Write a protein that binds this ligand. Sequence first.
Ligand SMILES: [Fe+2]
Ligand SMILES: [K+]
Ligand SMILES: [K+]
Length: 571
Amino acid sequence: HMRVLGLNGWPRDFHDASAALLVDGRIAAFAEEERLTRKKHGYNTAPVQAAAFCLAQAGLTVDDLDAVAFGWDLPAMYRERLGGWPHSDSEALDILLPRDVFPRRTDPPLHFVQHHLAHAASAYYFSGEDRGAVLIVDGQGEEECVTLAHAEGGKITVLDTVPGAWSLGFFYEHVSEYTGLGGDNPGKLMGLAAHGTTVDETLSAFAFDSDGYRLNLIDPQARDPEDWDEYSVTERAWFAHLERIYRLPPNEFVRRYDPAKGRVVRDTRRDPYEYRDLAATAQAALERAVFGLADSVLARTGERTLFVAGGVGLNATMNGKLLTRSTVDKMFVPPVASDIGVSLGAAAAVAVELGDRIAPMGDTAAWGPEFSPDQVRAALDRTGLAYREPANLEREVAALIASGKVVGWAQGRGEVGPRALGQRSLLGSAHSPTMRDHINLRVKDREWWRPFAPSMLRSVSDQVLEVDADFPYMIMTTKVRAAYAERLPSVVHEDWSTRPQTVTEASNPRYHRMLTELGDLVGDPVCLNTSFNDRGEPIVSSPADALLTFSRLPIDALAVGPYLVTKDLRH
Ligand SMILES: [Fe+2]
Ligand SMILES: [K+]
Ligand SMILES: [K+]
């Protein structure tokens, strides 16, 4: 047995803390720190809770680990940007895996994996493809924002990189911040982009070419001498530039006491929807730049399978377009394309180096904690709420969804990555022309313009989608076929695009069974599946998380383990 615990997250200026445990090339456990701490983005912390979960899940201690792997070359970052790496491996381990939580007789071997290699490994080794072109499009690794590489024979070989100051990831975040959506919410910008019109996709900054892009706006070697990434420098250049060329200045954040909430709340001075043309233009710029990069690495490596990772790899809209490009035959993008994935990627790189073969992710991201009926019942008993244990939970949930009710669904192992995939989901009718507004406005109290996406049986996706492939992660858009382009108004855009999850019976028997039951009711084993949370918290993880969220949102029912809780509608 090779047992490799991969980590991301550090107490200093870090985000997306996570931990992943590989046992014999298989993912035994994987969690994001935020889901456990309830603090979004897992900022400024070693993945203490995630790693503790991984070990508990696998019945291991640190002494059982062959290696600890970290998904950045942190010593290099310290030496380059901070004047030196002051920690011995043991001191680094004490910080990554504090001894009060992680008792140990001795130190496991500690590996620092170069950040983009970790990203790349998170795609390649888990894709189930033996070779392909690697495109890493990121905020920034230690120094580069882009890496082009060749994956083959179990090896990843870098062909080229692009320096941090030219980051497409930072660019997009800066635009997202500029619009008031926030640099921490690039996914919103992508959603907003669909509502805008693109004027000039260069934004008077990019020049596009067949291999990617240039950004003459910024010295490619520019560097923040007072930090260890170029975010601040790129932020300043982009904000100054955008204000010059775009009709609207930055959308400012407003902090005011709201007597209705009894607290100071953060709002935006302007409606971000006003910036929709900026959003559309940014999205078009990003796509175009990335098309060039992808074409380039595919041509250079002579592959037709594309692996994408890095934070920009979460741009599902861009991914769908990459997928239809004449230069691409197959694509794999892991659900953890962002920095949360570099724990797993670092683990894989190390495990591979130690001679293990890495198994394919296989159409599931359900690697987080799960809870037994007794554990769920314990959380239920805390609330004093009445509940039922349906003889056929999946059937009853199907009928609730069919009738236009919104159902919390907390089952099995929590998914990893930012998408709910039927382990921690809010479910609703894909067929309802009012469900979208209901969930945006009534349920999650958020922006009317946010899109929703469908889960569907893999066994019907051939008929529903124009492409007969697995879409296990909702990380890639595609188009529905004519026969379904009007049946599914809550989850299919005007232009027939959608960002689906396909579900196999093996990946998730209960969800699969539920979708099946729903199919007998509404014709199509397809439902709306959105994240189980709202805007203020990470996706719920524990049964207590689910009950808490259930109780503060006008959700109709909660299916948590074998139990069904419905809204206390008695007066
Ligand atoms: Fe990254
Ligand atoms: K294609
Ligand atoms: K009730």
